[PDB]
Amino acid sequence: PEMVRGQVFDVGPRYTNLSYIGEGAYGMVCSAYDNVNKVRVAIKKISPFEHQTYCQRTLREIKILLRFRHENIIGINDIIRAPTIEQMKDVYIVQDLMETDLYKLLKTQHLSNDHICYFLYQILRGLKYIHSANVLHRDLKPSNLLLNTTCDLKICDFGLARVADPDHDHTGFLTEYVATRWYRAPEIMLNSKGYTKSIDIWSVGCILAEMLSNRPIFPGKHYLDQLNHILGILGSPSQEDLNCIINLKARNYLLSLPHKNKVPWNRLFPNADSKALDLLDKMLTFNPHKRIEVEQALAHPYLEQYYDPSDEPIAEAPFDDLPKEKLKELIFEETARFQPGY
Numbered sequence: 272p273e274m275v276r277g278q279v280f281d282v283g284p285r286y287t288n289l290s291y292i293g294e295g296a297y298g299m300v301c302s303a304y305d306n307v308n309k310v311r312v313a314i315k316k317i318s319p320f321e322h323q324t325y326c327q328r329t330l331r332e333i334k335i336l337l338r339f340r341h342e343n344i345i346g347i348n349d350i351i352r353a354p355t356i357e358q359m360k361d362v363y364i365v366q367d368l369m370e371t372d373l374y375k376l377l378k379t380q381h382l383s384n385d386h387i388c389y390f391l392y393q394i395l396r397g398l399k400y401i402h403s404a405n406v407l408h409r410d411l412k413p414s415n416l417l418l419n420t421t422c423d424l425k426i427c428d429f430g431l432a433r434v435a436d437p438d439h440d441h442t443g444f445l446t447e448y449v450a451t452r453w454y455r456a457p458e459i460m461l462n463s464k465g466y467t468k469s470i471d472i473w474s475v476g477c478i479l480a481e482m483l484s485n486r487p488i489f490p491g492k493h494y495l496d497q498l499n500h501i502l503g504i505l506g507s508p509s510q511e512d513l514n515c516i517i518n519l520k521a522r523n524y525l526l527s528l529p530h531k532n533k534v535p536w537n538r539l540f541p542n543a544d545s546k547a548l549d550l551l552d553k554m555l556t557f558n559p560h561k562r563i564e565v566e567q568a569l570a571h572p573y574l575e576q577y578y579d580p581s582d583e584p585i586a587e588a589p590f591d592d593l594p595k596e597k598l599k600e601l602i603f604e605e606t607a608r609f610q611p612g613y
């Protein structure tokens with residue numbers, strides 16, 4: 272079995288000439304030569320069978336990526352695992368090798384307006400397909416956007432994804448949340464479980480702002496600081512936007528704050544294209560109900576060079592009290608189609 276900078280990475284005879292890329296949530300990431308297709312691929316080693324939450328996230332992601340088929344969504348090319356449940360300790364997910372991610376790119380590269388425009392179009396095109404499947408990504412951020420050498424973009428990491436549930440989205444003030452703090456919509460900290468499509472649009476708005484200046488727009492250092500960062504730019508919510516918040520604790524918190532004025536987008540981003548800032552404003556709308564939807568954003572004048580609804584496909588059909596033993600068995604059965612026996 273092949274070994275990489277420490278431990279076992281046995282991807283069989285098919286995948287050879289391994290190189291360490293980095294580290295994922297449940298294990299090591301490597302590049303490898305696929306001897307069948309004759310191209311270098313990405314391979315993620317996943318070891319989740321000890322913790323049922325890690326099992327839930329692995330299963331949920333495998334299920335979604337196997338049903339999804341879209342140019343702007345990372346596919347699963349192959350899954351490597353032992354022939355029996357007893358011998359299966361790890362799972363290897365084989366995917367297209369990409370050059371970088373938008374996180375790494377933004378740390379050192381200034382994006383031209385043309386690159387921002389194309390990247391945003393591909394994010395929203397992939398997001399249109401996800402939302403058409405009644406799925407919410409819920410963790411969109413630059414490190415979950417993969418890019419190859421020709422700037423083709425693919426959304427990855429569906430570990431926190433859920434089926435949209437708008438009628439059961441309400442919760443109390445300060446409800447604990449899992450997704451990356453800086454890309455969290457303001458309603459998460461007030462009265463939302465993040466079960467509505469509008470939560471993803473907020474994250475895309477944050478990514479767009481980050482592509483414009485190479486810095487996260489709302490870098491909250493803790494749970495409530497996140498909301499303070501958002502309000503420091505959007506300013507105080509209007510009476511109408513406050514009246515939409517029925518939760519008394521959440522509404523009174525906002526009422527307790529001194530008045531804050533809106534920071535104009537053109538002063539925050541003085542070299543940005545005016546149409547980019549108009550779309551940014553609509554994505555970073557405080558009120559989730561007034562926030563632009565994915566199809567409206569694709570139809571915005573900023574994306575006119577790319578918009579083609581007939582070339583922006585949708586999913587063919589819409590898409591945690593289960594023990595780790597049942598989940599391992601479900602992971603085993605979900606990955607069966609890649610076993611050589613067929």
Ligand SMILES: Clc1ccc(-c2n[nH]c3c2CCCC3)cc1
Pocket residue numbers: 292300313315345366367368369370371372417427
């Ligand atoms: Cl530097 C870099 C970053 C990401 C990838 C990559 N390419 N393809 C994938 C990944 C990461 C894990 C998901 C699938 C390759 C090189």
